RNA sequence: GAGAAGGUGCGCCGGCUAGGGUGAAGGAUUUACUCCGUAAGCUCUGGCUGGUCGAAGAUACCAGGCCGCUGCGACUGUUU
RNA sequence: UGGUGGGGUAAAGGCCUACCAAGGCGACGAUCCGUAACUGGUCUGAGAGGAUGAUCAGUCACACUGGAACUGAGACACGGUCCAGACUCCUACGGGAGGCAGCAGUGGGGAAUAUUGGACAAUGGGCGAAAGCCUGAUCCAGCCAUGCCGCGUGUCUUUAAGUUGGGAGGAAGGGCAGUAAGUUAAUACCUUGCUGUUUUGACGUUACCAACAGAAUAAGCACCGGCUAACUUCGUGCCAGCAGCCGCGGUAAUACGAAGGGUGCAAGCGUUAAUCGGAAUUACUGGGCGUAAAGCGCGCGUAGGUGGUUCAGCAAGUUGGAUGUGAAAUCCCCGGGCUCAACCUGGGAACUGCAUCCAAAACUACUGAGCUAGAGUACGGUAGAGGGUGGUGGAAUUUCCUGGAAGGAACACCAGUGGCGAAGGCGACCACCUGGACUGAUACUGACACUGAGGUGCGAAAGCGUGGGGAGCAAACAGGAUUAGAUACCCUGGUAGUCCACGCCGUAAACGAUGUCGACUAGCCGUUGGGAUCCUUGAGAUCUUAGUGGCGCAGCUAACGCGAUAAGUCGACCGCCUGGGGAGUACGGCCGCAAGGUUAAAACUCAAAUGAAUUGACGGGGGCCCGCACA
RNA sequence: AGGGGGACGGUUACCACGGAGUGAUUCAUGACUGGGGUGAAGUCGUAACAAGGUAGCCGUAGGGGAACCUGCGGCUGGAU
């Protein structure tokens, strides 16, 4: 069966990043919608598109660079099994800090830059690089 | 192999068995010669080597190589044992050290005098 | 196999106590070669507790000795 | 294991007790079994860790061995008593005594470890009004390169060492005889704390300063074939030997024995041993499984691991701060000192930890109401070697006999890179009692979920049960032909067996040598079952799905090759692997009537076995061709 | 006088050591055996690697001096 909601979306776009398709649609949750909103603010994707009907869905409009697109890999860290609840002193600066390292906290599912300057740690979700 | 299966049954690091059945974490161990005799090497070489059989003070029945080019270890000596596996001799893993108690010492042996038992 | 091997209790007198079987002072009726159950009496088997006497309590008569390797015949039986 | 009555401990408590009840512990590993003081820490490490408890400090534990109390504030007491045991000793045979794991020391074991030392002067203690008195604790000395530092063996200095002359610091105070104080009822007087002087007491007796004679008193070790840039010969000749891995030696030896030189770093240099490391070689960080080692043969599913979807709530995990600590030591920096370094300390840093406290609500668990996607059912319709029972068959072949009579067994074609079942598996014809999926939709459920150690069924055939059958073949064999020989393939013959009913074994080249499940990422060509689209006569396209195949990119792969039925990208979980032999074997458990199966080791031994791929060679490998090679 | 209260007594439970019977579970040893490893290889041999001169291999029964053969289901890790 399917066992993890957001690892099912982070896999399904990377094989579409190496494919020639642009609009990815899947049955989505609020959990998958709160993740999608933060990396369009980091310049990676745009227009998450809650379908706003019954069985609501996410149409993430991923951008292309010329040739190889903008997101090489999305590495899951906290999958559901070993779920990597991590503090604020130990946040991962993924690729020198050029990965933004989104971490689920109480006051927001938020990048590692604002996770440290307002100090709450928690679920280190995925590599965005 | 997964982290669930590690909490169920964790990965046991397998121990490495030691090379010497005797010398129970001891750098030397005294023995008494049962028998000194002659042994042939392994097939791609050919020679005549002289090995000893000893009973140790741990009561163990192993073979040690008399590493001299001449010795007077006369069938009941009190020879002292180090480790090290002589390659060409099969199945044996010990050496008699030179100049210990009853090991007289190799004649002249003018270099490496700390090895083969020479004064000065 | 096995009653393997080995062990413990055992007389008598009390104290307390659990029942079982038979029975009827009279009541139900099928007013009798019958049911219920009084009660005592009689009888059978317990359990717990003391006490007590002797060298000794299945005190006599009566009443398995046991164990370990083996050969042969499987076994109960039959025979000069 | 609780409950009460009592009993009892300095103190709670089945701790002890009587009786009441049938609870308690344990798959998060009980109980039994082997092993070991534990920790601050220590050692290797990038760290994670791994190994580890010698000096140092905390706690524990023991005192020949065992039981036991006593006294005391405190013991079940190391130089106490009692009892028992083992041992040992003195006897004048009456009676007695001893316990070094206290400091020396002795045997004895072992590779291996020290002096029958000096003094309470410092620091403690133990008694004391005080003086002090004792202490093998201590302060401190011989012995040992055992580390860790420094230092010296000369480039005409004299350091060390030695001779001599000097020379602090370890001493805080005690005696005393005034001097002042304040308890005093009487600073009369004692007793005490203060003041200044005098008297005195150092185990190590010196460090340390400054003279003197003169280079007189000081170097050794291992290697030199490689990847270690230290790299002639002489003797020796597959001898003698060296070595960690290759190897070297079989007659000019850079590999082995000297000399002759260098080089490593030095009062030490080396090699034996043990630890971690490189070792991603047990991979949490951070590995594997089609063919190298490795997917149970697959199911149903217990604990468990993880769990679609939304609001609200909780605050267990998660997150921040607060406070106590996390002892001191060690370590990490800044220092202070020994003339310098060790060493010594001062300051902090560090101690990733622990509970308590308040604050947070994105996510997880939990709680509640839901939502329809996952999953299930009500409705046909076919497809289908599902599977089983009973029959009805046919030709051969076989066996008889005058073309018929007789019975066994597998069912040519239909047959398919087809169906069906979780899997193993399964085809003449025929009914009869029965499965699960597909699909067409229409209805409803409200995650009911997948996976799953144990656990539980179910699994090809030879088997051997417990009963029958009977054709061909054929395990078992006899010869026939054949070879040194057949014990072989070929030749003539045949019981067990396949079949049946129940039952057992539970084996596999159970193989797709690929666990189950879901999600998603270019395709293209056949082929199976539905269904809908289709100008429609189908000769059929397209589309839609659930299977079964071909080929191919992206993709991965060691390569072969996989390639939406992954061997990709992932996610949950499970089984499994740790070099080749020994070995799927011994021993123990379980099952079987037996054959055996299942779980499953080390001892030893080897530096390699293995995987795909390439060149060459080889082939009683194929296919073409050449030449009197064949007439 | 004595009483109270102690002390030695008497014997009752508790128990270490010891005893006995019968078992477990471990360690060493054991005549004699059975494979295993490494050697050096004398030997019947040719069993595998080519279509290895009878294609190999696996399970299993069954059978035979050996390195080995048939059968039934099995697999190409099988090629012309």
CATH code of the domain in which B48 resides: 2.40.50.140
SS3 B51: strand
- Which chain B positions have a beta carbon within 8 Å of A81's beta carbon? 2-4
Given CA atoms A66, A112, A12, A25 in this order, what sign does their dihedral have? negative
What is the 3-class SS of chain A, one letter each residue? CCCCCCHHHHHHCHHHHCCCCCEEEEECCHHHHHHHHHHCCCCCEECCCECCCCCCEEEEEECCCCCCCCCCCCCECCCCCCCCEECCCCCCCCCCCCCCCEEECCCCEECHHHHHHCCCCEEEEECCC
Domain that holds residue B51: 4-117
A99/A71 Cα distance (integer angstroms): 10
Show the tokens assigned to A129.
Answer: 């690089």
Give the distance from CA B81 to its chain's centroid: 6
Q: How far is B17 from chain A (nearest CA, A)?
A: 35
β-pairing, A57-62 with A23-27?
Answer: antiparallel
Tally of structural domains, chain B: 1
| Resolution at which this structure was determined, Å | 2.9
Q: Do the Cβ atoms of B33 and B77 come closer than 8 Å? A: yes
Which chain A residue's Cα is nearest to B3? Answer: A82
Nucleic acid strand D within 7 Å of B13 CB: yes
Which chain D positions have some atom within 7 A of a protein CB? 28, 50-51, 109-112, 221-224, 238-249, 257-259, 268-275, 282-284, 287-289, 305-311, 317-321, 360-364, 371-374, 449-450, 517-522, 554-555, 568-579, 602-606
β-pairing, B61-66 with B94-96?
Answer: parallel
Q: Using what technique was this structure determined?
A: cryo-EM
B104/A62 Cα distance (integer angstroms): 87
SS3 B119: coil
B85/B19 Cα distance (integer angstroms): 9
Which chain A residues 50-69 have CB under 7 A to strand D? 54-56
């Amino acid at each position: 069966s399917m066992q993890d909601p957001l690892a099912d979306m982070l896999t399904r776009i990377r094989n579409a990043q190496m494919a020639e398709k642009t609009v990815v649609s899947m049955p989505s949750s609020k959990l998958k919608a709160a993740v999608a909103k933060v990396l369009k603010d980091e310049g990676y994707i745009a227009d998450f598109q809650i379908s706003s009907e019954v069985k609501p869905q996410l149409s993430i409009e991923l951008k292309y660079f010329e040739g190889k697109p903008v997101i090489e890999e999305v590495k899951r860290i906290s999958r559901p099994g070993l779920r990597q609840y991590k503090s604020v002193e130990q946040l991962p600066a993924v690729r020198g800090g050029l990965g933004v390292s989104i971490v689920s906290t109480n006051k927001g599912v938020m990048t590692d830059r604002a996770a440290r300057a307002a100090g709450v740690g928690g679920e280190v979700l995925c590599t965005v690089f | 192999a997964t982290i669930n299966q590690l909490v169920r049954k964790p990965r046991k690091r397998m121990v490495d068995k030691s090379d010497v059945p005797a010398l129970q974490n001891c750098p030397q161990r005294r023995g008494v010669c049962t028998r000194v005799y002659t042994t042939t090497p392994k097939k791609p070489n050919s020679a005549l080597r002289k090995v000893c059989r000893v009973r140790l003070t741990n009561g163990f029945e192993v073979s040690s190589y008399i590493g001299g080019e001449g010795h007077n270890l006369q069938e009941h000596s009190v020879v002292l044992i180090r480790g090290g596996r002589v390659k060409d001799l099969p199945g044996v893993r010990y050496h008699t050290v030179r100049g210990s108690l009853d090991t007289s010492g190799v004649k002249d042996r003018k270099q490496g005098r700390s090895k083969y038992g020479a004064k000065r």
